[PDB]
Design a protein around this ligand. Sequence first.
Ligand SMILES: Nc1ncnc2c1ncn2[C@@H]1O[C@H](COP(=O)(O)OP(=O)(O)NP(=O)(O)O)[C@@H](O)[C@H]1O
Length: 381
Amino acid sequence: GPAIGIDLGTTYSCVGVWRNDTVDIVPNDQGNRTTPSYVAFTETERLIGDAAKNQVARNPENTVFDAKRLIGRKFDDQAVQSDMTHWPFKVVRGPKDKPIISVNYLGEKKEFHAEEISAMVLQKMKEISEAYLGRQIKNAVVTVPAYFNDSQRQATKDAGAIAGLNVMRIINEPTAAAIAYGLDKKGTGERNVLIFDLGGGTFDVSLLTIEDGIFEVKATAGDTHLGGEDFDNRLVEFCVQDFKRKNRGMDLTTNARALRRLRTQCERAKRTLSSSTQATIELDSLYEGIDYSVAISRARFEELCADYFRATLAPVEKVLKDAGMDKRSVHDVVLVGGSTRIPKVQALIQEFFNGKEPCKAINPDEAVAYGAAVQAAILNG
Ligand SMILES: Nc1ncnc2c1ncn2[C@@H]1O[C@H](COP(=O)(O)OP(=O)(O)NP(=O)(O)O)[C@@H](O)[C@H]1O
């Protein structure tokens, strides 16, 4: 049958298919090409994606996200123990030091491995692809960060198997982006490719070398706690303080629904600021019947995340140093991840590369899935 390519992201997942000998990115039920990597359990149903993410404030203990931060890892890992302190869902020690997510589902305590949560997200990707292609799908290529170990790779493959997918190969995310642009066919000799990947929760910089279609990850650097979510946090913080001074120090964070309405609008304001210089937040009866509105400029947003945007350049320096390579030696600079849509992030990378135009023709949050779909087709014959 036909083969698909899946980008199983920390915050958003994306699937690419083949129609008429080309790659199509599968739109979900909301017309979006990316789906939140969220699952939720209630007394009557399980919710996936947007439906799960939108009810997070109403059901925090049973809304699971960030399964990618847990997949193939051990319960006692310092990274796992640190992440657990910011999660409202319960994580316990299972046998063989395996993390167990503990929720309530259909009126009973239910346990899940991180790969069972990721399997739900992968099953949703299989469903939308089947609806889109009008046929059964099993063959897939699933991507992972280049730094993932054998345990994390195997657990991602297991998530695929639990979802009913035949995982033909687990490939690296930066390699998938390079494949998406046909960088393994661009010129003669050796090709140096830098993948600049800024998504919802993570920042990954990878330096690859290509020679005669063979890819080699030379160096990787980044921050697993730097993404679009942190930029929203800065906008949310600004609006929370602005409501305090407008309303005698009143704190809207005490009301989960009010904070969620604000956060939802900060996310949309941020997205508007990638195409417009002005964004408007206007929320009637936000907190204690008090109306809230604010005009947020692109300059203000850039000023609020000034430190974050600057900190993206250090891992670019780290990959070039680690490989003993100069920035002028890079033949292709590839923009990957939804947060690379931010004009200031684009301007900073281009300035660093002395005006060099990046590879950005493919939607940055779709490139990994696009590349995974190309690889899937090759492997499927
Ligand atoms: N037009 C836009 N302007 C600014 N940010 C955007 C825009 N569109 C999407 N984003 C951000 O893109 C992020 C999701 O990036 P995406 O690359 O889809 O996540 P991912 O694949 O799960 N990677 P990650 O979270 O790092 O592991 C969210 O924080 C969005 O707010």
